[PDB]
Amino acid sequence: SGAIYVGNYRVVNRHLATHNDWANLVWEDSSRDLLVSSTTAQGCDTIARCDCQTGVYYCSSRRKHYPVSFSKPSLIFVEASEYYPARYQSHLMLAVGHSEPGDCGGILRCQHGVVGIVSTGGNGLVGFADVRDLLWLDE
Ligand SMILES: Cc1nc2ccccc2n1CC(=O)N1CCC[C@H](C(N)=O)C1
Ligand SMILES: [Zn+2]
């Protein structure tokens, strides 16, 4: 689990969005596994606006933060699951690192702030859904 709280928005993995998230939907994208909903309280997370390829992510399955080198957001084939059929997820970044079902939601951060959240994994590789291009989250 996990979410990004910026201004009056909450960003979660689309496959984990709650009834409250859908009832207050701002934007969702199945191809990116992202959902954004509105909040009444103010969020203080800072979104990175950069092209960083290094950062640190939180891995709940190990209660530890790990420094990673990651790829530029792209279209990557993601194996079938109970939430989605086998498809190409867009705006996805891979890193060599630990993850397991339950780690989605952990934040990836660089020196500029929040880069994205855990969305995929397997084979000793962790995938992160990029959020840096969602310029509207700050305005
Ligand atoms: C996060 C993770 N690490 C894993 C390691 C090994 C095996 C599975 C692992 N998952 C879960 C996974 O990849 N899923 C399930 C939920 C929907 C995700 C999606 N964005 O399509 C795909
Ligand atoms: Zn950065």
UniProtKB/Swiss-Prot annotation:
Catalytic activity from the UniProt record: Selective cleavage of Tyr-|-Gly bond in the picornavirus polyprotein
Residues annotated as catalytic: H15 (for protease 2a activity), D33 (for protease 2a activity), C104 (for protease 2a activity)
Binding site for Zn(2+) 1: C50, C52, C110, H112
Role played: Cysteine protease that cleaves viral polyprotein and specific host proteins. It is responsible for the autocatalytic cleavage between the P1 and P2 regions, which is the first cleavage occurring in the polyprotein. Also cleaves the host translation initiation factor EIF4G1, in order to shut down the capped cellular mRNA translation. Inhibits the host nucleus-cytoplasm protein and RNA trafficking by cleaving host members of the nuclear pores. Counteracts stress granule formation probably by antagonizing its assembly or promoting its dissassembly.
Subunit and interaction comment: Homodimer.
Name recorded for this polypeptide: Protease 2A
Organism, scientific name: Coxsackievirus A16 (strain G-10)
